[PDB]
Amino acid sequence: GYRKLGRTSDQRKAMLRDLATSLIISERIETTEARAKEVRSVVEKLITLGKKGDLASRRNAAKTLRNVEIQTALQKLFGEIAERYTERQGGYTRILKQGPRRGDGAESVIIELV
Amino acid sequence: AVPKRRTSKTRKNKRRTHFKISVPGMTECPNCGEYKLSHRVCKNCGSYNG
RNA sequence: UUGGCACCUCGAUGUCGGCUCAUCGCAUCCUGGGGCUGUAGUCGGUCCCAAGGGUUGGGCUGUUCGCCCAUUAAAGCGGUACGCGAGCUGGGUUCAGAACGUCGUGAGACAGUUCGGUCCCUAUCCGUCGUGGGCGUAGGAAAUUUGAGAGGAGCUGUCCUUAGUACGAGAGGACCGGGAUGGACAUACCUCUGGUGUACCAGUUGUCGUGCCAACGGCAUAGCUGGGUAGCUAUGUGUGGACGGGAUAAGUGCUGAAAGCAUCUAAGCAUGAAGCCCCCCUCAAGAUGAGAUUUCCCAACUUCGGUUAUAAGAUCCCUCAAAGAUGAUGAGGUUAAUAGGUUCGAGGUGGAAGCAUGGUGACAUGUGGAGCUGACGAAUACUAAUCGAUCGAAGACUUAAU
RNA sequence: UCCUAAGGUAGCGAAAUUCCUUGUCGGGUAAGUUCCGACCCGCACGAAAGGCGUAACGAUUUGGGCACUGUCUCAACGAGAGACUCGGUGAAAUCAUAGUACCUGUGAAGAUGCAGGUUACCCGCGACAGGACGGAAAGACCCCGUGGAGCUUUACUGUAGCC
RNA sequence: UGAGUAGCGAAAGACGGGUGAGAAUCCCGUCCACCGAUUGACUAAGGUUUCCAGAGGAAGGCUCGUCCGCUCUGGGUUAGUCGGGUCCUAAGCUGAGGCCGACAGGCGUAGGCGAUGGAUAACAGGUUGAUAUUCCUGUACCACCUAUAUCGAUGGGGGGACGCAGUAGGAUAGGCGAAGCGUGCGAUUGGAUUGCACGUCUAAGCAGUAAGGAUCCGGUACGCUGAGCUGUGAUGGGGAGAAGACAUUGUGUCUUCGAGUCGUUGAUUUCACACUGCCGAGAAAAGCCUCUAGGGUGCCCGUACCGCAAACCGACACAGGUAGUCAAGAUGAGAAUUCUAAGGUGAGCGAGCGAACUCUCGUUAAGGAACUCGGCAAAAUGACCCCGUAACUUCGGGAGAAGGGGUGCUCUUUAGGGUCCCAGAAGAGCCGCAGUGAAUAGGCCCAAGCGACUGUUUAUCAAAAACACAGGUCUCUGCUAAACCGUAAGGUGAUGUAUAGGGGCUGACGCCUGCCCAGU
RNA sequence: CUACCCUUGGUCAGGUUGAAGUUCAGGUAACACUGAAUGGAGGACCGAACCGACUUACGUUGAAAAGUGAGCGGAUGAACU
RNA sequence: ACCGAUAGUGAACCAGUACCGUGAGGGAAAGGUGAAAAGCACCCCGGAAGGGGAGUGAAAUAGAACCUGAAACCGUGUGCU
RNA sequence: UAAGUUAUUAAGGGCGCACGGUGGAUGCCUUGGCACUAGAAGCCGAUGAAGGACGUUACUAACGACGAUAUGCUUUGGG
C-alpha cells in the first residue's frame, strides 16, 4: 500500500481508477484532501504513458482508465492532454484547499491539471 | 463499573477546563479585503494568488 | 494443620486446582564464608553466618497430595480473603433429568458411584503504566551539564593444565591457582538463515465485459499458486552479569590487664563472605533547598511611582518521518530538496507487447536478462509548503564588600 | 448343632454396583489412580423394577493408534470492524455532602476520612484492573414462624363411589 | 451526575450538472459494485388510505435534508363470465316437539347454518399520474323475456366419487445453433465469408387425434362415451428489432405510412390416479342423465396500495417468523457451486489515522498434541472413473471397509447411440511448480460400556444409558361388555363381539427363568 | 402461542441400491434347486428446498425477553404444513 | 365551624377517554391574559422562527409556552482569596 | 559581586453580592364535586325498550339538538 482510505484494497483501486478518469475528463474536480493527495500520483503516471505514446503504452494505460465517452478517455489522453505537456517534466496537477464542508468537516480540495 | 458517588460541580467544572475550541487561525486576504483561512482560497469573491 | 468460641457480614463477602502476574519471611535446597569430626585423600555428618541470584520437562488423577520416567548446581519450606474469577477456566461440587448398590411400606435419603448442565459489567475515586499543559525557580531566551535521591543487573556448569602431583599398601585422587567453551536469563539490532509482506513480478481455473481474433479488466477468501523489496520480527546476529575499593557477620588472631600465671577484649592493632556502601547501566533541580557553565537581546513615553509595544526567541498555518492514540518530538517552508512527480540506479520477478520464422495444431525460437516495479540511494523545483498574523524584557527590597 | 416360610440356582463378578482400594497378577507406555484380560476376597450381583450374549444402528460414554496441524515449545507478520483524532446527534445502571495518599497500629477484632510518622506543585488525555467488605437481586444454603403449598402413608377425622 | 461519555442496527460508491437562504445525504447523468430457486414477478391472510399530483419543513427519520411510508390541499378502486351470495355439503355449532336436571341449564330427533373440497357462461390488444379478464376496440359464451306431442317430482336408479408407490410412453411450453430480415462495418497490431438483434398472435366455433376404457329405468338369471395435442380460419385484424417524413435541445415527442415470421435438435417437476403393484383398503350432497307416480333484460360484496416487508406478528423505519403460483444462460445429477439475464439495489451518519486491546480472516522456520479435564477448535480426507477390500454376521450386511492408480490441451486414425444431438478405444505430441488447477462435496482404524433398530423430550442451561417400540407374560371383560366422562339424560369403547376390548409389568433376536404362599 | 384430536387441502432439485414376484434356461416321477433377464420394495443409502437444535465462537444497557456465523441430524415418512 | 385543582367524584377538561390487553378488565394527565380583544396598524434584521421599536392597555418580565412565580439545576459579570 | 527576605501571575477553582433563564410550588379564585334536609316520584317494553350504528347545516372534521318532514314541523298560552 501507500495510504489506505477506509476502503479495502479492491474498493480503493476502483475508486482511484474512477477519480483519475473523472479528472482527465473534466480537468478539475472537487474532492476530499486525502484522496486528492492520492490521485496526484496516479494521474501524473498516466500522462507519462501518454507522453511515451507507444502501443505498449496505450495497452498499459488502458488497464487503469475506465471506458467512458466524451472521444474515449483513452483517446483524450495521447491527444490533447499529452500534447500540451510535451516539454513540462513532472508537476502535471495542482491541488487547492477550499475549507471544511458542512456535515463532515472534511477539508474539501479542488484538483486540476496545471 | 458504576460511579461510586456523585460528582460535585467543582470537580466537573475543573475537568471541563481544557474542553474548548480555538480561534480559526485566519488572515486577511489582500484582494478581497475580507477575512480568510490561511493556505485556503478566499471564500469571498476572489482567489488564492499563492 | 484438625479443632474450640460465636466477635464483623444473611436489604448476598463467588468454594477447589491450574493459567497469567507477582510480592514478602528465613526455620537455607544450590552457590559463598567458617568451628568440631569416630575429618588420611575424592566424598560425607553436624552445627554457625548469609535472602544476592537461581530453584526442570513429562506419565497417572479434577487433583492440592502422592508414586513413577529422564534430568539438574539445585529441583527449599511458608504468608499475602489456603494471593489472584470488575483477569481467565470451570474438570470437581451444591441446581433440574436419569440409572446402579444399599436404607424406607411410602413420598424419597445417602455410608457412595455414574452420564449431562446459561459464569454479567461502556471504571467514577484512590492505586499503577505512559504522556502533555499552567505556573513557579526576582529581566527575557538558546544549548550543554552536576547529581540529592530512585530504579536495573547480581545465577551456575563442563573440560584442559599445575598433576596422576599432595594423601593413601593399593583402590582411588585434591585445596590454592591459570585458561577455554556452554545452560538459563537480559538487552540492542536486521548484514546473514528464516517468517510476514491485501498499490511488486508471473502462471493458471470458471464466468461476464472492452463490437470480433490478439491484448487486457471485474468477480470467485488476496479466486488460487510460485516467489518477493522496504518495514515489523526469532528460532537469527552482536553484547552483558568483568576487575576492583571501604566497613563488617560467623571464625581466626597479635600485644594486654583486671586475676604476679592464663586469656582475641576491657584500652589498642589486624584479618575475614555470593551479603552492606561504592565501582557497572538508566532516570533525575517541582531537589519550592527549584543548582552550574557558555552564549544572545537590553529604549521611548510618563509623573505612574508605571506603560508600551517590540528585540533575542517561540508558536499559529502549511509539506513530512527516523517519531507517533492525539498531541508532543524531530526533518523543512522559496535566501528551499520537505514531500509528490520526473530522470538514473540498487533489490524483486523472470525473459513482455508487436513483428518475423518453424510447425496441421497445442506450442517453440529470435530481437532484448527483455519489460514491468510499493516503501530503498542520488539528483531536479516542474507542483505544493503564498500572503500574513499572534506571544515574548526593561530587571523588587535589605546588609556586608568594593 | 441353632433357627425359619425356603435360606440364592444357572450365569456373571473390584462391575453405571467393591468401603478397605491406586486389591493381586498380566498387557499397552520411557513413566498408566483411567483402560483391556484374568482371580474371586460379591461391605452391599442375580433370573421378566428379568440373568447372560449379541450382527446392524447412535450429533451416546470410554481407552489406544495413523495422518494433519500455532493447540503448544514461543510467539511473529498482514487484512477489515470497534477502539484512537475531527464534524452532526446523543443515553444508562449509580449517587448522604466531599478539597477523596502510603506504612505500622487502633476500632463492632481486614481504614481513603482516627493516632504517630513518611511521601506529595495546580488541570487534563490513552491504558490496567488491586480496593471502595465495587454494582444487580430485602441470601436459593443454615436457622426461626404454633408461616404456606405440592407429594406420601397401616398419622387423626371425614367423604365420592362400591357391596 | 455519570458526560459531550457508549451507541448511531450486518453491505460500495465516485464524479458532473441542477435547484436552493443552506447539499456527502434531494433531482437528472456516466462509470463502478450487489442479488439473480432471488433483494425479481404475482397473489391468501393481516394491516386499512400507507396509493397519485401540487405545495411544506415546527415535530417523526438514530446525522443532514430543499427529501419521505411525515404535515396541508385536491384526487384515485368501474364486472352478467374473476373470488364469495341468490347452488351443495365435512368437522363442528344450533335445534320445534323431546329426554334429564335445586335454579341457571345439560343432551338430542326432524330441520338448519357451514369450506379448506364439489358444481358454475371471456379472451387477446390499447389506455391514465393514480383502476384493468372490470373502461375502450375486436371477437365470443351463458340464463331468462317478448314476437314471426311436451313437462315429468320432495320419490326409485346411474353418475358425481376419490389412497400410496413405481416406471413406459404421446404432445406441448420453455431452451439453444444455423439460415431469413433489419441496422452496424470500427479500436490500438490485424480481419472484413465481420459484429449485433428479431422471429409471432387468444377465446369460441368446426374438423381429427398418440393413447385409454322376473317403472318402459336399475339389480337377477336364461360402435360407445369421453380424450391431451395438431390444423383452416378468427386475423386485409393486432403487435414489433426498428425505418422515412413536423414546431420552440421540437431531449422527448402527436401524426400517417410500410417490414421477416422458416425448418431442425434435445426435452419438462406442466399435460392422465390413466395402466401395473401393494396393504394401511383409500368423504358427503347437489349440478347432470334417467324411470315411472303425475329485438331485449341480467342484482349485492371485494377490487387502490404494502405483501420475506420501512405498510402484517415482534413496543421501534427491529439480522427473527409468515401459506401458495412462476423458475432464464454457461457448467452440471441438480431448484447444488461460481459468474451473469429479465428486473431491482447501493441499505438514513461520515472524514481521518493505520497505537494498545477485543472481534472476524490469511500465512508461518524446526518439531509435532508436548497443550488440556479433553486433539475442544482448526487443519487434514472430500468430485468422477478404475482395480482392491478383513475379523464378524440375524446371510441382509460390515463396505464408500482398509489400500492404491488416473484426471489439461492439440492432432491423428476409429464399431457406437437418438433424429443436429449424446457416448466411446487406442496412438503421437505440447506445457507448468501444479491438470475435479477457482467455488462445493467422507479422515480412518483397534477394543470396551449402554440401549436391539427409525422415532421422541425439560417452548428460553439437560436430548440421553431416559420415553416409545415390535415381541413376551399376567389379568378383568358373554355384550346395555368391562373401563372411562358426566357421575342425570347422553356418550366414547364400537356402528366392534374373546384371533375382540381395558389395565399392570418387561422390552428386537439367541440360551434360559431356580426356591418359598410365613405374612400383606 | 403451546399439547393431542377431528375434517378437508398442500409440499418433498436430483442420484443410487436392487426384496417379493414373474419369465426364459437347465434338473427331477415330481416338487422344486442353480443361472440369466424383467420388476421396483424399504419407519432403505447420499444430498438441496423444507423441519430441527449436537459442538463451538460471538453477544450479554445484545440487532433480538432465546439470535447470528461455522460446522451438525432427518429429509417417502411414527414426515412437515 | 364540607374540598378548593397532588384536594373534591376515576372524570371542574369535550374521561371511563389517550391508551393497554385475545378477552373479561384496568385508567390517567390537562384550570386561571385583560374590566373590554381593544389579541401588536406600520418600520427594521432574518428564508421562516424569533426579536427591536412604535402603538392598545392602568400594567406587554399581561403578547395566547398568557395571574403570582419559589427550590433543585444552568449561566453572565464582578469585591476578597 | 556576595548572603538573606519578600511580591506579583489564576489555565481553572472557593466564598459574597447583582442580573437573567429553567421549572411550576405557594397565595387568592372557581365553571365542578362531597355529605345531607323537606316535598314530587319509585318503573319502560311486541303500538318494538334500555342502549347504540348511520346520517342531517351554505360550508362540518367534533360535541350538543334532531331523524329522509332530519341543526328540526304544526298549534294553543307566555314574551
DSSP character string of A5-73: -SS-HHHHHHHHHHHHHHHHHHSEEEEEHHHHHHHHHHHHHHHHHHHH--HHHHHHHTTTS---B--BH
DSSP B4: S
Bridge partners (DSSP) listed for residue A32: A108
* Residue range of the domain that includes A95: 1-114
Does residue A99 belong to the interface with chain B, where contact is any CB pair within 8 Å?
Answer: yes
CATH code for the domain in which residue A93 is found: 3.90.1030.10
The answer to whether the beta carbon of residue A103 comes closer than 7 angstroms to any atom of strand D is yes
CA angle, residues A95, A6, A77, in degrees to nearest 5: 45
**Do B42 and B31 contact (CB within 8 A), yes or no?**
yes
Contacts of A23 (CB under 8 A, 6+ apart): A29, A39, A43, A93, A111, A112, A113
Determination approach? cryo-EM
- Domain locations in chain B as residue ranges: 2-50
Taking each helix axis from N to C end, the angle separating A33-52 and A9-26, rounded to the nearest 10 degrees, works out to: 70
Q: Where are the beta strands (DSSP E) in chain B?
A: 26-28, 35-37
User: Domain tally for chain A?
Assistant: 1
Residue A95 to residues A65, A110, A112: CA-CA distances in angstroms? 21, 6, 7
Taking the CA atoms of A95, A99, A104 and A106 in sequence, report the sign of the dihedral they define: positive
Which of B21, B40, B44 to mutate against chain A (most A CBs within 10 Å)? Answer: B40
- What resolution in angstroms does the PDB record give? 3.1
Q: Which of residues 10-49 of B touch strand H (CB under 7 A)?
A: 10, 13-14, 17-18, 20
